[PDB]
Every structure is written in C-alpha cells, then in structure tokens.
Design an enzyme around this catalytic site. Structure first.
Site, PDB file in Angstrom:
ATOM      1  CG  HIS A  37     -29.716  16.210  34.225  1.00 17.20           C
ATOM      2  ND1 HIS A  37     -30.448  15.551  35.189  1.00 17.20           N
ATOM      3  CD2 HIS A  37     -28.431  15.819  34.396  1.00 17.20           C
ATOM      4  CE1 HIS A  37     -29.643  14.786  35.905  1.00 17.20           C
ATOM      5  NE2 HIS A  37     -28.413  14.932  35.445  1.00 17.20           N
ATOM      6  CB  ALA A  38     -31.430  19.835  29.603  1.00 15.27           C
TER       7      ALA A  38
END
Length: 88
Positions: free
Chosen positions: A15-16
């Site tokens: 993620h991110a």
C-alpha cells in the site's frame, strides 16, 4: 517461467508508496508478470489489481514472470522487496 515465494515485511504491506514502487518496477520489463495470494491472482503491473489483493505486513505472495527478460524481472522485484521498499 520463473517464480519465487516471498514475505512482504514493510509497515504498509503493498500500500501507499511501496505499492507504487512495486508496480513501477514491474512495468520496466517486457515479460508478463503475476502476483498470487490465497487463491487470488492479479497482474503485477496493475495498481487496481494490487489494491484488490489486500496485502498487509507479514503476508506472503508468489511472484511469476514469463518472457524474454523473466529472470531479470524477478531479480529486480526481490531486491526491492528485500530493501523494504527503502524503509527500516
């Protein structure tokens, strides 16, 4: 076909910023590349696909690549993951 099984050890999982780095790195190669987790399989070059997989810290994935530069593509993804995407 070349494959590897590997643990994702960074805080945010896929993620991110780590998710963006993963997809950007996969896109540098001509080979077709896949990511598997719990009987689900997606395109490694697709951000929507990676998001749908829901990979958290400590989870395990299987990477696969098929094409002219399949060995080099797997090496690059492993190196990036083992640096924790540039984090402690």
């Amino acid at each position: 076909m070349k494959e590897v099984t590997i643990e994702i050890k960074n805080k945010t999982g896929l993620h991110a910023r780590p998710a963006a780095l993963f997809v950007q790195t996969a896109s540098k190669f001509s080979s077709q590349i896949w990511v598997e987790k719990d009987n689900k399989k997606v395109n490694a070059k697709s951000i929507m696909g990676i998001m749908s997989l829901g990979v958290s810290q400590g989870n395990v994935v299987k990477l696969s690549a098929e094409g002219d530069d399949e060995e080099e593509a797997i090496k690059a993804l492993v190196d990036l993951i083992e640096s924790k995407f540039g984090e402690e």
